[PDB]
From a paper:
The set of protein arginine methyltransferases (PRMTs) is a family of enzymes that catalyze the transfer of a methyl group from S-adenosyl-L-methionine (SAM) to the guanidino nitrogen of an arginyl residue to produce S-adenosyl-L-homo-cysteine (SAH) and methyl arginyl residues. TbPRMT6 is the homologue of HsPRMT6 in T. brucei with 31% amino acid identity. The overall monomeric structure of TbPRMT6 consists of three parts: a SAM-binding domain (residues 36–181, blue), a dimerization arm (residues 193–225, yellow), and a β-barrel domain (residues 182–192 and residues 230–368, green). The structures of TbPRMT6 highlight several structural features that are distinct from those found in previously characterized type I PRMTs, including four stretches of insertion, the absence of the β15 strand, and a unique dimerization arm.
Residue numbers in the entry:
A (entry chain A): 25 to 227, 230 to 367
B (entry chain B): 26 to 226, 229 to 368
Amino acid sequence: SDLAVHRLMLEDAQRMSFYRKSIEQSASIEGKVVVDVGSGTGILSMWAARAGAKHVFSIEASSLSEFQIGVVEDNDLSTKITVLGDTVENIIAGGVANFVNRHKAKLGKCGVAVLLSEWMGFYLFHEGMLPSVIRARNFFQDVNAALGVLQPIEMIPERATVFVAPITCKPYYVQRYKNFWRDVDGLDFSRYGRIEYEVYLEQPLVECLPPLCLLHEGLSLIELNLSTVQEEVLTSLHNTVHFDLKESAEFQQHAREAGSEGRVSVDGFTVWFDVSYGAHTLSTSPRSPSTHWKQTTILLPREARNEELVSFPVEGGELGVEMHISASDKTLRFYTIELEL
Amino acid sequence: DLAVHRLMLEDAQRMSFYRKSIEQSASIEGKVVVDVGSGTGILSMWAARAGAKHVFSIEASSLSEFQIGVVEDNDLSTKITVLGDTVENIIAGGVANFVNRHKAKLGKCGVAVLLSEWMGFYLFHEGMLPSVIRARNFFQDVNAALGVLQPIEMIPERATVFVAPITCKPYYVQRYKNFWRDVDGLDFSRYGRIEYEVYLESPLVECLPPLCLLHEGLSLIELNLSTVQEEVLTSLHNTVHFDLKESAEFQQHAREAGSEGRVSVDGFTVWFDVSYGAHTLSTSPRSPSTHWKQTTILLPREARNEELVSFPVEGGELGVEMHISASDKTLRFYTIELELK
């Protein structure tokens, strides 16, 4: 069921606020034509109409589209929103000219000004909808060119960013395992905690991490301009970042707890994303309210971890990692993440 | 494995029942106890702490190896013997072999108490009662060979399946209607009905709001754990009649119906209590939630939609025959069927 997932977008205050504010405070909506790709409940389309859009094309391939038409009617907006119950890909296959001829009156003199969408998946790409958004963007820009309009469509969100940070797993182990298992009605069950923890780590980990796990605030790994980004880039996203732990407040926090002759080991890397539009940002960092997306953690091998093979003295040092986020097939909807020190 | 047993350890009601029952028993101190399906071994360790002469801890999963370490960790190794096998395999070994292997620990006492948490969903489903029955019979045979005739004390000593008619409307409201009613000024009610309508597809394992109850609940099945034999487990069935005229839970809804309105029945919810001495572990909707929740069996959608089973404000009488039947010969998996009277 599609209402399954959509509910938690509507349940998430950060996601709701980001889109509400971006739409209700943008300059290209009132009197303009908007496209909502993968509109599900149609919340974004309805916000756009309410905000005074000339017209909204709501694109939703699932059977939920029939019901969205009903909800649009229930909120008295059937005149401002047309639901296209089809995939972006099939609409494109029908062609520009056919689309123009059919929707000529709604398109108006200025064609499509804004493209709204929530396409993000885990670590921004995994199970995401980004390719459809890109294909939709190019399609509607050709629709616009057919009408003599070359103004680039404004994208919401307009930019996205993948962030990465090294982590220590000890704050996670402490808070999630060690403190529960230390005392069970006066019995020492710590052995159970260690077992539960080691094996949970072996079973990419999508979980909310305690902020204390961070050995560094995080660095930008990949940045996308949603107006210009093309599909070809999505095959393999890769970059190399270098953490200066000597300058990191997060690292020093741990450096303190290890004493003055202590060591700080790295257990892995956590990955999250932000998207933005204008002054607004929706973030999935461990320091932000959690979301369905949580954070994605990639651990170093158990031996590297257990033997503390990647560690630093209490005054810090430098750490470099090359990360690859790679499509596992041609849909560009499913990804893996690998890293190399 | 461990994930499950953590939930037991995380449930205050369950922990409290067993701890208080073990403390209340007059039959533990100086005597031998068997803990069937001991998991973390928490029950065995409580029994040891309560002064048992010795404890046989029976756990067939890989946890057994780890429970041996936790026992040693708490200096209980001379008190607890962990048998890393199934009840059935230990039984297959025979009375003589068991007597021989554990002669010194058995002494002249034999086994005086059998501890276990065997309960499944609505007491039978995915539970291990048959294994507990076999264990009890086997240890009473070991006892006879030892000259001991006293019946083994079972904790819990009794179990009861409870059933009540329900209305789903307070569920609809609290889980669906309240949420979808207003989404930032928008009426998304149509989605809530879709979501609720489909979700009602059979038996529903879910925590139901007590407000759903149309009667406080009636005993359907009662087991004496010392005496119950396997043969009764094939088809457990009975008929109960609910007096809705004298029911406070029904008046709750009678009041809100109006003098001309009616109160309709959407189905029946099933739960269980187990007890020992003055203590009771309950999984009723009015009790703190537990992993077993409650199990709800709904009437057909037509009977629910056309309110075919309904009562005037004065109430009336509702009869139901319920069958809880084994779906195979293991007696661990069950189906629930009902018929209105």
